[PDB]
Amino acid sequence: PFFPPLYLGGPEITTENCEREPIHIPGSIQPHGALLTADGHSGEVLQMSLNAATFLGQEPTVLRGQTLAALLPEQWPALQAALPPGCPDALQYRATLDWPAAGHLSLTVHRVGELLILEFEPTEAPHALRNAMFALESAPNLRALAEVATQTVRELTGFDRVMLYKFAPDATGEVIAEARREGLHAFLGHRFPASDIPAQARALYTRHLLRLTADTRAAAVPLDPVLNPQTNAPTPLGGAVLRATSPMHMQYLRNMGVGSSLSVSVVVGGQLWGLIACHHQTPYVLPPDLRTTLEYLGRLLSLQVQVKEALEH
Amino acid sequence: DPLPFFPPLYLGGPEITTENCEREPIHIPGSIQPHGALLTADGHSGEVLQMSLNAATFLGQEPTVLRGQTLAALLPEQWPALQAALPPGCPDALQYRATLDWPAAGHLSLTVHRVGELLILEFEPTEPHALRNAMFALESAPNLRALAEVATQTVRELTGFDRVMLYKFAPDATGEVIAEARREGLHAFLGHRFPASDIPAQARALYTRHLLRLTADTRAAAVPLDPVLNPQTNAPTPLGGAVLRATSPMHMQYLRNMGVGSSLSVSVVVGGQLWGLIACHHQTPYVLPPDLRTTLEYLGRLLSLQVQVKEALEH
Ligand SMILES: *C/C=C1/C(=C/c2[nH]c(/C=C3[NH+]=C(/C=C4\NC(=O)C(C=C)=C4C)C(C)=C\3CCC(=O)O)c(CCC(=O)O)c2C)NC(=O)[C@H]1C
Ligand SMILES: *C/C=C1/C(=C/c2[nH]c(/C=C3[NH+]=C(/C=C4\NC(=O)C(C=C)=C4C)C(C)=C\3CCC(=O)O)c(CCC(=O)O)c2C)NC(=O)[C@H]1C
């Protein structure tokens, strides 16, 4: 099982007890967006990230009273239809909001039990995705598929390094393709222990297929209140991309000289086959619409890996 | 009985009947649908060889002027990209797409693929989070029926088509409509089954490699290529990978008898086999722009993946 989180008097995490860190409930988010939780029926805002005034423009404790019906009149009915009670936590709905102060905001919502989790990020206001799709499909074998996938993603994103990281049957990792900027260490061909991506992370990544750390030196922003009023318990944040990254993994990234990290799960036959794993040397917030392109490529690659491995075997 | 293709009509081949359906060489009709234009060019020199007879209307140029230039002169910014995207020996399924600002005809969508030493260039006029929301909705559908229903409803909302069907093949190649979204007043095809010969063997083979085809207007006359044969080979120009390809007259007749003015389908391919089609009808003629068709192409791949995932749970 998991330990209690740090904010509920749980022990500090070390290399001895990696597997037991409750990474899904850090009680905090990354500072490049804002997060609100809300009741499923009433639409009453229960928790907010302390930075919410920056993004939303409203005052701190005035939001706590209001309902989503009031705040988001046009979207609140769509949210009720899109995310009905009993739907999975993996199901997400997105909209673009013309907010007065902050301009265009991306809104991403999902449901966990009776709670709606709302994420707000800045956002902007072509054929590279279609061209990529056809390129992946005409790759003659798994090796070429891997090369095309890493190169495509680097071209779409500008990331300093993009790797395809394949899990062996014992969860040992191997870098089987790599696209990188000139003047970086090559990780191509190297292998890494299973504990670098511990079992609870692997399980989470089988269900929610994208996660990132935008800035490996940025401080997390707590939720207020930290605990969910409904349950007096931790708010599950595993399906929230804004979730704070495990401090252990943030230290690991800094030791590698990485300023920004992102990965996308490749899932084949219900199992985590591998990751499209990205690094940038400097901090880097990839905008939500470009992340959606990588999410699409995750599904396409999942399909193409099966197709290609049927030819291998 | 599987039998090889007849020569096309323009090489003295016989007229097609219900007795010889399967032998129609549907891939080499020598003609296109009138809502776009098509050019062929030599893959190394870029010399323009064939053009649809309507090419002047779309490109705003004299045919003799078009044919007297290379693609290097005609498309100075695209030509190097084409060469890089479509290297010699690449499969004919591989497509490169770009948007052009053409003075006489506004924004054109350019779609290119390579067959041997020939480049085939298709030109069509072109012009928020629905796809992402659809992706997650499809993945959360609890079983195969719910997946089929969400998929048909989603395609109908995106396109406005009068009818959208999920058409599933049985092992004997008969087909059945297993879900549909339809306009009010249309009679249901749900549960109906159809013979294998309605989608003959050469079409099914073609539809396993090239995953989208359409007939924008079921009464429109086809536009010949000029010249009709490829000058490189003095043989027919393969058009199986061109969406502008003229549709079999036999299928056009079938659609007119049903009261269908526009038709479109997307292949659902599972384990290298044609599992089914997303099949769409409109009562009036209807041109879906290339960027909206790309959304349906993505959905085709997602559905292929999800059908495999849902059927694995059904065991
Ligand atoms: C005591 C536990 C340890 C630990 C924990 C840990 N690791 C992750 C997540 C990731 N680790 C990754 C590992 C690599 N990245 C690379 O670039 C390479 C090789 C060149 C490796 C082996 C990756 C890719 C992830 C996923 C996240 C990402 O893409 O950045 C977590 C979970 C983090 C989270 O989601 O909150 C945890 C708890 N890592 C260790 O090395 C030991 C000390
Ligand atoms: C003598 C040959 C015949 C024949 C040939 C034929 N049919 C197609 C293509 C299609 N037929 C389809 C059939 C149906 N559409 C429906 O809506 C229903 C039922 C409600 C059925 C059974 C479909 C979906 C296609 C695919 C194209 C499309 O989506 O419109 C071809 C190939 C056409 C081409 O690609 O050029 C051919 C040669 N059909 C017959 O019925 C017999 C007379």
Numbering used by the authors:
A (entry chain A): 7 to 131, 137 to 324
B (entry chain B): 4 to 130, 137 to 324
Provide text from the study.
Prototypical phytochromes can exist in two photochemical states with differential cellular signaling activity, called red light-absorbing (Pr) and far-red light-absorbing (Pfr) state. Light is detected by a bilin chromophore, which is covalently linked to the photosensory core of the protein, comprising of PAS (Per/Arndt/Sim), GAF (cGMP phosphodiesterase/adenyl cyclase/FhlA) and PHY (phytochrome-specific) domains. Important for the signaling is a stretch of amino acids in the PHY domain, called the PHY-tongue, which changes from a β-sheet in Pr into an α-helix in Pfr state The chromophore connects to the PHY-tongue via a strictly conserved aspartatic acid, which is expected to play a crucial role in signal transduction. To address this gap of knowledge, we recorded time-resolved serial femtosecond X-ray crystallographic (SFX) data of the PAS-GAF domains of the phytochrome from Deinococcus radiodurans (DrBphPCBD) at 1 ps and 10 ps after femtosecond optical excitation.
Two propionate side chains additionally anchor the chromophore non-covalently to the protein. The pyrrole water is ubiquitously found in phytochrome structures. The strictly conserved Asp207 is a key residue for signal transduction because it connects the chromophore to the PHY-tongue in Pr and Pfr. The A-ring is covalently attached to the protein backbone in phytochromes, which renders complete isomerization impossible, but is sufficiently flexible to accommodate the proposed changes.
